[PDB]
Amino acid sequence: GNAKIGHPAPNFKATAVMPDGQFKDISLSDYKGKYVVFFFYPLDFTFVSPTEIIAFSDRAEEFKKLNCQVIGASVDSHFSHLAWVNTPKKQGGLGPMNIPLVSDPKRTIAQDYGVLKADEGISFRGLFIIDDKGILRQITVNDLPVGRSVDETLRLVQAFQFTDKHGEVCPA
Amino acid sequence: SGNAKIGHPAPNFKATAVMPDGQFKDISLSDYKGKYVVFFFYPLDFTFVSPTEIIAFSDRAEEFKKLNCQVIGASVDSHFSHLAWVNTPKKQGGLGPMNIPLVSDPKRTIAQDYGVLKADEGISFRGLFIIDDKGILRQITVNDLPVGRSVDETLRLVQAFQFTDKHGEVCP
Numbered sequence A: 001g002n003a004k005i006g007h008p009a010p011n012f013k014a015t016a017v018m019p020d021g022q023f024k025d026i027s028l029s030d031y032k033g034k035y036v037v038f039f040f041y042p043l044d045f046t047f048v049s050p051t052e053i054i055a056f057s058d059r060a061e062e063f064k065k066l067n068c069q070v071i072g073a074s075v076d077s078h079f080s081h082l083a084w085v086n087t088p089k090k091q092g093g094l095g096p097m098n099i100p101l102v103s104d105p106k107r108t109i110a111q112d113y114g115v116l117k118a119d120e121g122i123s124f125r126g127l128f129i130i131d132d133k134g135i136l137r138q139i140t141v142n143d144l145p146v147g148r149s150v151d152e153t154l155r156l157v158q159a160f161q162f163t164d165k166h167g168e169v170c171p172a
Numbered sequence B: 001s002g003n004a005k006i007g008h009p010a011p012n013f014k015a016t017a018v019m020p021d022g023q024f025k026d027i028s029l030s031d032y033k034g035k036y037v038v039f040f041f042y043p044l045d046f047t048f049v050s051p052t053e054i055i056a057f058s059d060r061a062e063e064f065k066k067l068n069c070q071v072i073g074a075s076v077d078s079h080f081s082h083l084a085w086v087n088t089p090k091k092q093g094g095l096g097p098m099n100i101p102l103v104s105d106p107k108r109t110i111a112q113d114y115g116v117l118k119a120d121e122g123i124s125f126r127g128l129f130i131i132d133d134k135g136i137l138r139q140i141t142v143n144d145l146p147v148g149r150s151v152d153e154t155l156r157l158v159q160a161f162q163f164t165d166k167h168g169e170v171c172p
Ligand SMILES: COC(=O)[C@H](CO)NC(=O)N[C@]1(C)CC[C@]2(C)CC[C@]3(C)C4=CC=C5C(=CC(=O)C(O)=C5C)[C@]4(C)CC[C@@]3(C)[C@@H]2C1
Pocket: A169, A170, A171, A172
């Protein structure tokens, strides 16, 4: 792919299901000025991904406190995303979301980020930390069965922000 | 770039390492078939963030041994540089005695194979790779230089891959 540490993260423009339940076309560049956590999950209506998606959504305020936007993505259609959002949580659904969920039906965003599982047209569990200038700072890719940690993601975002500011602090 | 792809054999290498007993030995990734491997790069010796990471993995090597997991560190520095850093006591800014081997990659080919060579600076990013007992790459982690890695998170991942290896694999 085109995701390289220290280089601009690949832009994308894609339809997402937004927290209000409506569809909107969004771009990574919409979020310049904020840190971004951009994470891929394989498919809707699965059993490892909902733990991650719900954790990032439940804890969205902790990312907001770090001026950090979280965005999820999968190759499944935006209609499929909303169907899972609208599935009651007690039946295995996501429930209302605090983060947008991008649809990548052409697989070009996963390819751009180097996380397409080519023999099975879905993304690996890629997670990318992009700074406020659009520069890629961190790459995480898990094989399909193993999920990610919101605690670890917050540790990384905060640490990148602290090290960003080091030489810019008052010299008193 | 690089040849490190999830679900494919992790790129083999054969290189000089400083072993835990303080002596040089030429080792290969394939030496560790039958065990999980955590293989991690750091930018160069005698630095300031890297020793904290190296010493943390070394100090906690027994937690990986309990998981039948070998930890291996690497950088582009010469094998003599590694030994001098080990031979410098921790209280004077060195590593002190190590429980993990440290691989030397002076031709930069291992860093290139794993896709973590930083262009025109001749050093690796903070790459970390989880390789299963069959030699297959399961996890990719790459941090930009200012932010270190977590032993807790690495153990979480190794444990999670070993957990999911227990159910549903092609050979009963
Ligand atoms: C007329 O234009 C202006 O006033 C502009 C601002 O717009 N100031 C400006 O250019 N200062 C200059 C000339 C240029 C910038 C530097 C060299 C670098 C930072 C600086 C050492 C420094 C950093 C940290 C605080 C400081 C004092 C505090 O009371 C405090 O709370 C904080 C947190 C001081 C100690 C005040 C002086 C300081 C700002 C100087 C002085």
